[PDB]
Write a protein that binds this ligand. Structure first.
Ligand SMILES: [Ca+2]
Ligand SMILES: [Ca+2]
Length: 234
């Protein structure tokens, strides 16, 4: 995250870190005691998830590590198109208990309105050009923008993709390398997943592109209920 500041230890309770032997590579959002939502492009081999993490160097005495027991992507997702249905649901191998560091964030009841203030967070780069990974997650507030802004900035962005456009029109505050899969929280509601953006980070007229969580509510709910053959909206 660029143009932000360190998150308070109490500010990111639903934030999950994805890691392998090299280190953190993605984020996710805890949506239930045993389910995590992230971007499909965060899929990897030989990885685990850390919950209740603040500092990478100084452990919280009660931070939790979990394995991906089951992974679900849209059955009607097109491979070779990274922006098509960039969403993945993961079942944890065991439940996590609630604490001041770990609490689930619920699925949204309605889509967000243009102009709403949204919260972004992650352990991604805090400098726009050089890669500078922070020890603690960084947090920033941005605006939900009209889809036309992202259309004007990204020639490859199809209107068919179910996305949200968020940032600062003129630039300056943005997600950055390593923030993939994290939450976009607008007016306290979980609305987006960090999916796509530009480098250098925070350029004017090149806002962040986020997976629109609301559209996938029925698919997510169906899988949690037990219907593993559930389809995503076209
Ligand atoms: Ca504590
Ligand atoms: Ca519904």
């Amino acid at each position: 995250v660029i143009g932000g500041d360190e998150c308070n230890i109490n500010e990111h309770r639903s934030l999950v870190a994805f890691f392998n032997s090299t280190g953190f590579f993605c984020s996710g959002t805890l949506i239930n005691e045993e389910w995590v939502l992230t971007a499909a492009h965060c899929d990897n081999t030989n990885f685990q998830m850390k919950l209740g993490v603040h500092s990478k160097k100084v452990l919280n005495e009660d931070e939790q590590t979990r394995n991906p027991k089951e992974k679900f992507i849209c059955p009607n997702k097109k491979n070779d198109e990274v922006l098509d249905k960039d969403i993945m649901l993961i079942k944890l191998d065991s439940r996590v208990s609630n604490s001041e560091h770990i609490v689930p964030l619920s699925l949204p009841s309605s889509p967000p309105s243009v102009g709403s203030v949204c919260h972004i967070m992650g352990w991604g780069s805090i400098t726009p050009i050089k890669v500078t990974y922070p020890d603690v997650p960084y947090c920033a507030y941005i605006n939900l923008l009209d889809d036309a802004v992202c259309q004007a900035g990204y020639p490859e962005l199809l209107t068919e993709y179910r996305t949200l456009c968020a940032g600062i029109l003129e630039g300056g505050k943005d997600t950055c390398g390593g923030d993939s899969g994290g939450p976009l929280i607008c007016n306290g509601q979980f609305q987006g997943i960090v999916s796509f953006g530009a480098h250098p980070c925070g350029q004017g007229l090149k806002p962040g592109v986020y997976t629109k969580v609301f559209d996938y509510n029925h698919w997510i709910q169906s899988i949690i209920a037990g219907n593993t053959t559930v389809t995503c909206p076209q």
